[PDB]
Amino acid sequence: HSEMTPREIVSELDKHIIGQDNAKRSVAIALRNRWRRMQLNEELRHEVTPKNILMIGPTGVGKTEIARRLAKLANAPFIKVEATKFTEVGYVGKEVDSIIRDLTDAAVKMVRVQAIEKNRYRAEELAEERILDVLIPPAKNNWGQTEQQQEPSAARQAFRKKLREGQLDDKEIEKQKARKLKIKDAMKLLIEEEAAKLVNPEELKQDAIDAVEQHGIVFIDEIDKICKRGESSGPDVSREGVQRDLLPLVEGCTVSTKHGMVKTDHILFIASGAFQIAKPSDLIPELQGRLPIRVELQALTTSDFERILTEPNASITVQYKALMATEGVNIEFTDSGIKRIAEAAWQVNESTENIGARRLHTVLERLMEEISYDASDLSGQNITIDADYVSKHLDALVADEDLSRFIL
Amino acid sequence: HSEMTPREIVSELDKHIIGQDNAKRSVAIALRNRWRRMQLNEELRHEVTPKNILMIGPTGVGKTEIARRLAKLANAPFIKVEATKFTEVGYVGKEVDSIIRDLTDAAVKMVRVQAIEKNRYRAEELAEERILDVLIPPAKNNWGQTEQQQEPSAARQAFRKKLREGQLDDKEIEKQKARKLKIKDAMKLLIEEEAAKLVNPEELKQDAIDAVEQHGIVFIDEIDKICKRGESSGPDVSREGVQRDLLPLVEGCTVSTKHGMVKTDHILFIASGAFQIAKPSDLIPELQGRLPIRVELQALTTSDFERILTEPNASITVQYKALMATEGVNIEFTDSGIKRIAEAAWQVNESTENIGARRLHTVLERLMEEISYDASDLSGQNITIDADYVSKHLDALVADEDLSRFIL
Amino acid sequence: HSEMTPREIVSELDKHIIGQDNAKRSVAIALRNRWRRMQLNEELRHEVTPKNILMIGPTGVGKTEIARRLAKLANAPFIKVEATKFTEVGYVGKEVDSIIRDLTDAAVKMVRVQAIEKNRYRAEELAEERILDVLIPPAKNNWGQTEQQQEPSAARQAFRKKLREGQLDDKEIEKQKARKLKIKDAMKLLIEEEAAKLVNPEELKQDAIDAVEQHGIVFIDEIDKICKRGESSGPDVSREGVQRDLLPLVEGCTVSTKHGMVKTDHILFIASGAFQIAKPSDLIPELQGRLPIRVELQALTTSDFERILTEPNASITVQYKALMATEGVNIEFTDSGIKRIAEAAWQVNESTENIGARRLHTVLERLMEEISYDASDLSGQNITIDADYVSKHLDALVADEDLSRFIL
Amino acid sequence: HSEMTPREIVSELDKHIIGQDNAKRSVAIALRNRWRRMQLNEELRHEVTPKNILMIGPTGVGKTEIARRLAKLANAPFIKVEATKFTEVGYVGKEVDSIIRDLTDAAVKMVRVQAIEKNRYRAEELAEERILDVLIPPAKNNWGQTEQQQEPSAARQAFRKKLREGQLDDKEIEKQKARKLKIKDAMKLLIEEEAAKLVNPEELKQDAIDAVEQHGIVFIDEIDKICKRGESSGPDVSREGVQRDLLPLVEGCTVSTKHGMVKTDHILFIASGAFQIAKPSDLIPELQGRLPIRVELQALTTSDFERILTEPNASITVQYKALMATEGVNIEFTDSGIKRIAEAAWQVNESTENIGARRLHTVLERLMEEISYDASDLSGQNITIDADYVSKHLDALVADEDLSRFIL
C-alpha cells in the first residue's frame, strides 16, 4: 500500500528510534518490496516471497520498536510471539498456528476499530436527522425542490445549532425503538444503530484476512532460544521441534481461523535473537533459507540514552511534561538534568543487570515519583528538573547496588 | 487430469528445477499413473494404488521444489508436513489426521479462490447491468426483438463506454440493497453481490473432497527423523509410533473433515529424508511396502548454483531484475558476476554449514542490500552487477567465518 | 447375510491369498457362524457370541489380507487398528472407543457410497424426464391411457436417442433451480437432486449401525506388542492397560458414535501377532477367553512368492500388464522371468530384513521403472520380461546389500 | 422391581452359574433390598442405601457372570468398568464420571430397543392400515355402526389375508410420503413411519435416568489393582487417587449426562478382586465402609468344569449342538467326552496359566474346529463326540506345553 521509498521509511522510523540505521534500512527494504511486488506481472507475483529478516542484538536496544513502528507505519497487522512459548507444547502448549490466528484476531480488532472512524461522522450526521425529525416532524409529503427540504434550514437549523451543546431534552423515537428515552440518550442509542447499519459486516471480516495475507507482520522474539545448545539433548529436540513447527508458516501454508482460511505465503517475518549462546547458523537449514536478511543492532551508549530521552516524538520526557501539564504544572528538563538521568541509567545497567533502554523508564519514574504525587497541589508552578534535582533524587539509590536490584 | 506424458512432465519440471532428473522421472511416473488408472475397468481401479515415493537427499537440493511444482503442474491439492511434528503427541500434539484435514482446508482455500477467477467476469458483465439500469431505467416491459434490449446500445452503449473509468456518481440500487450510495461502492458492492449467486455449496465443498481423494499430494518431510536410531529406546517407540500413526493414511483409510468424509486410498505420498543416521530399511515393514519408489537426489555443485541463479523461470536473479525495474532501475548480471555469486554461496556452505541452494538466496540478498535501498534514488540508471561488484560486496563477509554464521 | 459354506468361503479367499489354508478355515468358520446364529431361537441368539480369532505369524505373510478379503466378501465394515496406538493414551491418546467410532464412520462412508449405486440408474432415469419435459413440454393435462403418455415415445424418443451423446445444448429448468443452465449442466445438477430425493437419510445412517453391530470386523494388529515383557515394568502396566481398555469391546459393551449408540457384542475380532517376544498365554486371562480361536500362518517360501506374483486375481503382475496396456504396450512375463523375480525378493529378505511378500512389490517396481517411464514412447510393442531382462535389472542391486536397504 | 425372594433369585441364577452359592446369596440379598426399601416410609427411604458388595476370587470363576445375570434378571442398567482404566488419568484419561454416563447411554440403548418390542405390533396393526387404505380407499366418510368399518372385513379381510406374503405391488401413500413406491418398501417405510408416533422423548429419556438411579448396577473389576502395594509410592497415590475419585460415586453424588442429571445414591456397586497382592483392608477407609458385603468365590474344579459344560441354559455345549443343527448336523456329546473336555481344560490351566472356565471355550472350540468347517458337507448325519474323538483331537495339543500357550 504505502508508496514510501525505503529512504522515506527510514526517515519516518527515525522519528521513534535512535540509531540502528542498518536495522532500519533492512526493515524498510522489506516494506518497499511489498509494493515492488504488486508492480510485477501475474507469474512473478507468486514467485517473489517476503524477504524475512533476523535481527541480532542485545536486549532492549530497539528491535521490537523498529518492528512495531514499521507495521504501524504501513497500518499492518502486527503480532509479537515469544518463540519459547511453544517449547512446552511437547507436553501440551499453544499450537504454532495460533500465531496466525491471533494475528487475525487483532487484525480484526483493528479493521473493526478503524471502521468506527469513518462511521463516526456520517454515523452521527444522519443520526441527527433522527432526533430532528421529532423536533420538526417533516411535512406530509416533502416537496421535491432539493431546497424545499432545506427550508427550515431555518426552524430546522435552530434545533441543529441548539443541538450543538444544549440538549439533554427528553424525547421519543423509533426493532427500531418506539420508546420514550431522553435526547441525550436518543442521541446515544442513535450513534450505534445508524453507525452499524452503515457497516458492511461481511466485507469487514473478509478484510482482516486481506490484511493478514497482504501486510501481516509476525515478530518472533528470541528465536535464538530455540536453537540447539551443548547443554543437553532432550530439550534440543523440542527446541528444534518448534523450528519445524514454525517452518510451514514462513515457507507458505494455510491456517484455519475462526474468521476464515488465511494463507501465510506473504506475511513478513521478523525474527529476533541475542545469539550469545547459539549462532544464526544453528537455526535449521530450512529456516535459515527463509531468513535471507541478517542485520545487527548495536548496544546503546549514554549518548544514545540522552537522545532517546528527549528526541523521539512523544518521547518519555515529552510525555511527562504532557502529563504534568494536565495538572497545571510546567515541567522543564535542563540539558544536564537529562545528561545525568541517562548517566544514572547506564550506571545501573553496568553496575547490575543490563536491560538496555528499558532502564530509562524506571530511572525516570523513580525520579518523578515526588512531583507526580504533588503535581495537583503544585498547580500553576514552574518546576525545573536540573542536574541538582536529579542527583538529589537518584544518586543514593544508584550507588546502593542491592537497593538498585529492587527499586530501579 | 493432465494428459501429459512423463517426458512432458519432466520437461515442464525442468523449467523450475535444475538437475535432479531421476527424482523428476520418479515423480513424473507417479502423475502419469493417475491418468493410467482412470483408463482402466472397475475392479482394477480399486486395486491399483498410488506408487508412493521416497526421496533421498541432502537439504535444499530440490526435494520439496520438485514435489511442489509437480502438485502445481497438476492443479492438485498439496500439503507439506514435517514428520517430527507428531513425535511429541505421545505427550500431546497434532493427530496425524490433521494432514488430510489441512490438505482439505487448502484443497478448499483453493477451489474457492479458483471460483473467483471463473466468476470475475460474471459480476463485470451480466452483473454490471446493475448500475446501467439505475442510469437508464429500462423500458416499462422491454418489447422483444433480441436486439431491442440491444437497440440502445447507443444511449446504452454510451453509459457502458463512459463507464471505462468515470464514476463516483452516487445513485442507488437493490436483502438486495436499496440503500443510497456511490459507484466506487455501488459498483464494487456489485462485484461480490452478483457472484455468490453462481457459486453454490454442495458442489464447491463437495469437489474439494473429490480433489484431495483423487489428486491429493502429501509431502512428508524428514521421514528419516522418525526411524529407529541406536542411542535410546523411549524416543524410538515414539518415532515408530508416528510411523504406525501414519500407516492408516498410506495404506487406505477414512478421515473426518469439517467439509466431509475424505478417503486416502489414492492420495499420492512423497516422503523425504537425508538418511545419514538411518536407512530406508529402518522404516517399519508396512511403510517400506507403501513406499515402493526410491530415488536419490545429488548434492548441488557450483555449476548447478550458477544455473539455479538464472535458468529457472522467475529465478531469484530474474525476480531481482524485475523488482528493481519497479524503481525504474535497470539491473544487469554479467556471466562472471553470477559465477562469483554461486562461488561465494558454495564457499560459505563448505566453510560453515551446508544448506543447499538456500544459501544462494541469502548471499544474493546481501549482495543487493545497497541497491535495494537506493533504488528509488537511482531511477533511470543502468546498474551492472559484475564480478567486481560481487567481490567488493561479498568477499569480506565470506572470508570471515564467524561473521558468516550471522550475516550469511 | 452370506449363505456360503465355510468351504465356499475358503475357495473365494483362495482367489486372493496363497496358502495359509488353516487361517482361511479359521476365518471362514467365523463368518459361517454369524449365519448359523440367526438360524437359532430368541434365547440362543444372545448367548452365542462371536468366536474371535488370534492369528499368529511372521510379518507380511497374509494375515491382514485374509481379514480384508473376508470382510470384503461379506460386504462387512472393516477396520484395522494398531494396538500400540493406545500405549501412549496413558499420557494422552486416542481412546479405545475410537475403534468402534471409526468402524462406524467407514461403515457409513460405505453404506452411503453403496447408495449411489442403486441411485445412479433411477437417479438418472427420472433425471431425463426433467431435461425432456422442456424439450417437449408435456400436454396440458396428459390423457390417462398409460400409452397416450408414451406417445412421443416418437417426438419424445427422438430427444432421448439424441440425448445418448449429442447434448451439451443449453436450456432451463427448475429451491428447484428456475435458472437457465446448459443441458450438459442441467443434466449434471439433475443427477444430484433426483438422486438425493431418492435417498432415505434416516435409514441410511441407521443402517451403518446395523452393519457394525451385525457384521463388524475389527482387526487389532500387533496385539502381541501389548503383552507383558521382561524388559521393564512401567510400560507393562500401560501395555496391559490397553488390554483392559480393549476388554469391554470384545466382552460386549456400548459405545457412543456421532451417528448413534453402537453395541459391540457381535462384532467379530481378529487379533494379530508375531509372538516372538511374548506368547498368547501372556494376554490377560479375560482376553484369552475372548480369543477362543488360534491359528498359525506359515512363513512364505519362494514357491509361494512365484505364485503370489501371478496367481491371485488382479495379482500385481496382472496389474502391471493392465497398466502398460493403457499405454498400448503388451507386457509379458516368462515363467523364468517370474521365477527369478521371486528369487530376488527372497534374497533381499534373507540377505537383509525379511518383510514377507511385501518385498515383491518393491522388487517388481524397481524392475519395471524402466518400462513404466518409456511405456508411452513404446506404444504398439510387444515387450517381454524374461530371465535375462530381470537379471539385468535386479542382480547388481540385489547383490549390493547396503544399496538394498535403500533401493529395494 | 421384581418381587422375587432371595431364594428365588439364587434359584434363577443357578440356571446360568455353577457353584458360587455364597456370591449368589450376597448378590440376591442386594436385589431383594431394593424391593425392601420401596416398602418403607419417607425418611427411611433416603437413609437406607445399597449394600454394596465386594466379590473376592480368582479369574473366570463367575464373578462377572453372576453380576451380569443379576442385572439381566432385574432388567436393570448394567455397566462393567475396569478399575485401572483410570490409574492413567493422572497423565490424562477417562474421568470416573464416564461410568455413570455409560451406565446411562446403555440405560438408554436399552429403553430404546425395548420400545421397539412394545411398538412392533402398532406398525403392524393400527398402522398396516396404510397399505389397505390405498388398496381399497375407504368410503367417502365411513358411516358408523362400530362394525361398518368392519363390514368389509370381506373385501377388506381379503386384502389382509392375502397380505400374508403377497406383495411387491407398487402403489403410493402419504412430510407424510406421497412419493410413489412398492410394498417391500411402502410396507416397511410404514414399519418405522408409524411407531415414532407412540414413542415420545421426555419420558423415554426421562426414564433412563429413572432406571440408572433406581436399578443401576456398576461392576468395578480389578478393584484390588488400585490398592496400595509395597513396591513404590508414586503409582500408589495414583491408585489411591482412583479410589478417591470413585468415592463420590458410591458415597452419593450427582453426575452430568447428556440425557439429564443422574443421582448415584442408590446405584448398586459390585466391586471385584483377586487379592493375592493386596487385601480388602488396603482399600481406603471410606471405600471399605461403602463396601459392606464381602463374599469369596472358590476356584473351579474339574467337576465344576463338567457341570459348566452342559448344565447352564444355553451352555457352550448346547449352543454348539444348536449351531451344527443349522447345518442339518446332529451333534452328540457322551458323558465321557465331556469328562475329557473338562479334563483337558484343567490340564492346560494347571500346566500353563490358570484362566478359569474361560479355558473351556478355547478347548471346546479347538476340539470342534474340524466339524465346524465340514458341517455343510455332512448334512443329515449323526456325529458323536465321544471320549475317543476328544482324545484324538486334544491330546497332542495339551501334551505340548509351548504349543498350548499358543493354540489353547
Ligand SMILES: Nc1ncnc2c1ncn2[C@@H]1O[C@H](COP(=O)(O)OP(=O)(O)O)[C@@H](O)[C@H]1O
Ligand atoms: N533505539 C531505540 N530508540 C528509541 N527507544 C528505544 C530504543 N531501544 C530501546 N528503546 C526503548 O526501550 C524499550 C525496549 O524494547 P524494544 O525497543 O522492543 O527492544 P528489544 O526488542 O530489543 O527489547 C522500548 O519500549 C523503547 O521505547
Ligand SMILES: Nc1ncnc2c1ncn2[C@@H]1O[C@H](COP(=O)(O)OP(=O)(O)O)[C@@H](O)[C@H]1O
Ligand atoms: N535443483 C534445484 N533447482 C532449483 N532450485 C533449487 C534446487 N534445489 C534447491 N533449490 C532452491 O532451494 C530451496 C530449497 O528447498 P527445496 O528445493 O524444497 O529442497 P529441500 O526439500 O531439500 O529443502 C527452494 O526454494 C529452491 O528454490
Ligand SMILES: Nc1ncnc2c1ncn2[C@@H]1O[C@H](COP(=O)(O)OP(=O)(O)O)[C@@H](O)[C@H]1O
Ligand atoms: N499369502 C499371501 N497371498 C497373497 N498375497 C500376500 C500373501 N501374504 C502377503 N501378501 C501381500 O503382502 C502384503 C502384506 O500384508 P498382509 O498381507 O496384510 O500381511 P501381514 O498382515 O502379515 O503384514 C499384502 O498387501 C498382500 O498383497
Ligand SMILES: Nc1ncnc2c1ncn2[C@@H]1O[C@H](COP(=O)(O)OP(=O)(O)O)[C@@H](O)[C@H]1O
Ligand atoms: N461358576 C460358573 N458358572 C458358569 N459359567 C462360569 C462360571 N465361572 C466362569 N464361567 C464362564 O467363564 C467366563 C469367565 O467370566 P466370569 O464368569 O465373568 O468371571 P470373572 O469375573 O472372574 O472373569 C464367563 O463367560 C462364564 O460363562
